[PDB]
């Protein structure tokens, strides 16, 4: 029954072309510095938690600096937590005083400042928005938020649902063009299979306000009517390592998310950042399975992006400046992921991303199609290959030890 508009369909293709975005988890939980789940993990009282807002002053926040650092990685979009499960709004809302402008001494709308910086730098802006809420007294309780001290575990769905829609209206009118709404929390009511999220009306609201905006919902199900992208939580499309999303794979654009260290919202214990090579491999492997990668940073309560995260972004971007052509604008490749790497493709080119190879030769199961040419992407040096009944065999100059040794094949 859902009919995407032309503008929406163009947006979907642009999203797939862009390939690489940065997740930003920032909320009051950054003060506690123990994770965005702390409020329900530690059964904190909702009114006591809200007192934190009077001490929230991220004095070194600079939206220009954030977006410039994110652009330097080769990322093309940002997904920002406008309001997480804690229920604190990081924007100037007229529907709750529990927001960054009214309830903190900082008194600044960081979502507006980020929107302006994104326009300056040519970065698209996506909004994460929590379907669940551990703070509001009208929010129904599912699996989480049962020990916040609130009086009405049933909530008042008509009131809560209207509040959500009123806020979505603000986010889709007051902050310029928005590339996507990224919903989360559906899983909180999976104990109640008859729970009615009333998503057709809510998705219709979004597309009415901005037809080009993409709707995603992190529910781990076959996408519902009106969704424009499909999300896989730390699990890569056809895979369920973390146990969070081993679902089907569909006709909508795919996106998977990873953290750069161990955490989403800022954790002060967590200073083990993954290597630049590991991060580049996340991006390449995602692209190789026809999926975007959303890589998360958790900003500090002083308003700075972690120093090590900024440096890792910079080095990923140095790689992208050389190899971005093999990622941007591509779709998942003809040759499926293997232990040695993955392929992406664009036009008549198949990029063979050799990530983990022990040998000086590589068999590729390319049988039906003729490989017209094979070169080293970096310098266009020829790569010899032979044909056998099962495909082709690349003869490489050495055992590759590069982060990603890309061979560019021409196929017609």
Calculate the alpha carbon distances from 166 to 156, 181, 306 in Å.
Answer: 15, 14, 33
Least Å from the CB of residue 227 to a second copy: 16
DSSP string spanning 313-379? HHHHHHHHHHHGGGTTT-EE-SSPPBTTEEEEEETTEEEEEE-S--SSEEEE---SS-EEEEEETTT
Residue 176 binds Na ion (CB under 5 A) = yes
Residue 11 dihedral angles phi and psi, to the nearest 5°: -65, -40
Chosen from Cl ion, a second copy, Na ion, none, partner binding at 18 (C-beta under 5 to 8 Å by type): none
The tokens for 146 are 């049962």
Residue 211 binds Na ion (CB under 5 A) = no
Binding segment toward a second copy, per CB under 8 A, in 4-12, 15-23, 26-34, 258-266: 4-12
Least Å from the CB of residue 178 to a second copy: 9
Least Å from the CB of residue 339 to Cl ion: 12
Contact track, a second copy, 291-330, x by CB under 8 A: ----------------------------------------
Calculate the alpha carbon distances from 363 to 173, 305, 342 in Å.
Answer: 53, 43, 13
Which of residues 49 and 77 has its CB atom nearest to Na ion in the complex? 77
Residue 206 binds Na ion (CB under 5 A) = no
Q: Scan residues 231-260 and list those touching a second copy (CB under 8 A).
A: none
Position among 7, 308, 336, 361 found at the interface with Cl ion (CB under 5 A) = 336
With beta carbons less than 8 A apart as the criterion, state whether 373 and 349 touch. Answer: no
Q: What's the CA gap between 229 and 227, in Å, rounded?
A: 6
Least Å from the CB of residue 5 to Na ion: 13
Q: Scan residues 195-214 and list those touching a second copy (CB under 8 A).
A: 204, 207-211
CB under 8 Å to 396, separation ≥6 — which residues? 357, 359, 360, 361, 362, 383, 405
DSSP string spanning 46-67? HHHHHGGGGG---TT--HHHHH
Position among 101, 335, 362, 394 found at the interface with Cl ion (CB under 5 A) = 335
Least Å from the CB of residue 14 to Na ion: 14
Residue 4 binds a second copy (CB under 8 A) = yes
Q: What's the CA gap between 301 and 27, in Å, rounded?
A: 9
Chosen from Cl ion, Na ion, a second copy, none, partner binding at 379 (C-beta under 5 to 8 Å by type): none
- Residue among 317, 316, 294, 297 nearest 307 (CA): 297
Residues binding Cl ion (CB under 5 A):
335-336
Residues binding Na ion (CB under 5 A):
115, 125, 176-177
Residues binding a second copy (CB under 8 A):
3-6, 116, 119-120, 122, 173, 176-177, 204, 207-211
């Amino acid at each position: 029954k859902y009919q995407p508009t032309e503008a929406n369909l163009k947006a979907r293709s642009e999203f797939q072309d862009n390939k690489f975005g940065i997740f930003l988890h920032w909320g009051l939980y950054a003060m506690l510095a123990t994770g965005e789940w702390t409020m329900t993990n530690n059964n904190l009282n909702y009114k006591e938690y809200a007192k934190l807002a009077g001490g929230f002053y991220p004095s070194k926040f600079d939206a220009d600096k954030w977006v410039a650092a994110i652009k330097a990685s080769g990322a093309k979009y940002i997904c920002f937590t406008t309001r997480h499960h804690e229920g604190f709004s990081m924007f100037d809302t007229k529907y709750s005083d529990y927001n960054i402008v009214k309830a903190t001494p900082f008194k600044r709308d960081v979502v507006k400042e980020l929107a302006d910086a994104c326009a300056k730098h040519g970065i698209k802006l996506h909004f994460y928005y929590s379907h669940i809420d551990w703070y509001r007294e009208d929010a129904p309780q599912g699996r989480t938020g049962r020990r916040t001290g609130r009086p009405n575990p049933k909530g008042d769905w008509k009131s809560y649902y209207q509040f959500m829609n009123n806020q979505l209206t603000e986010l889709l009118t007051n902050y310029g063009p928005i590339g996507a709404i990224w919903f989360d929390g559906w899983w909180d009511q999976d104990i109640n299979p008859d729970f009615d999220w009333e998503l057709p009306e809510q998705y219709a609201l979004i597309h009415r306000l901005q037809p080009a905006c993409l709707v995603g919902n992190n529910h781990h199900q076959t996408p519902f009517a009106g969704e424009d992208i499909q999300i896989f939580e730390r699990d890569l499309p056809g895979e369920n390592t973390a146990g969070l999303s081993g679902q089907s794979v569909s006709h909508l654009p795919l996106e998977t998310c990873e953290t750069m260290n161990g955490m989403w919202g800022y954790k002060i214990t967590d200073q083990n950042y993954k290597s630049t090579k590991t991060l580049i491999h996340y991006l390449v492997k995602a692209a190789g399975k026809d999926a975007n990668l959303l890589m998360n940073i958790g900003p500090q309560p002083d308003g700075e992006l972690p120093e090590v995260a900024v440096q890792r972004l910079k080095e990923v971007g140095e790689w992208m400046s050389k190899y971005g052509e093999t990622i941007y604008g591509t779709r998942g490749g003809l040759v499926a992921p293997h232990d040695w790497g993955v392929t992406t493709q664009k036009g008549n080119k198949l990029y063979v991303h050799i990530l983990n190879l022990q040998d000086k030769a590589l068999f590729l199961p390319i049988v039906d199609k003729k490989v017209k040419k094979a070169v080293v992407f970096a310098d266009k040096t020829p790569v010899r290959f032979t044909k056998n009944k099962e495909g082709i065999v690349l003869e490489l100059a050495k055992v590759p030890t590069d982060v990603d040794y890309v061979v560019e094949l021409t196929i017609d």
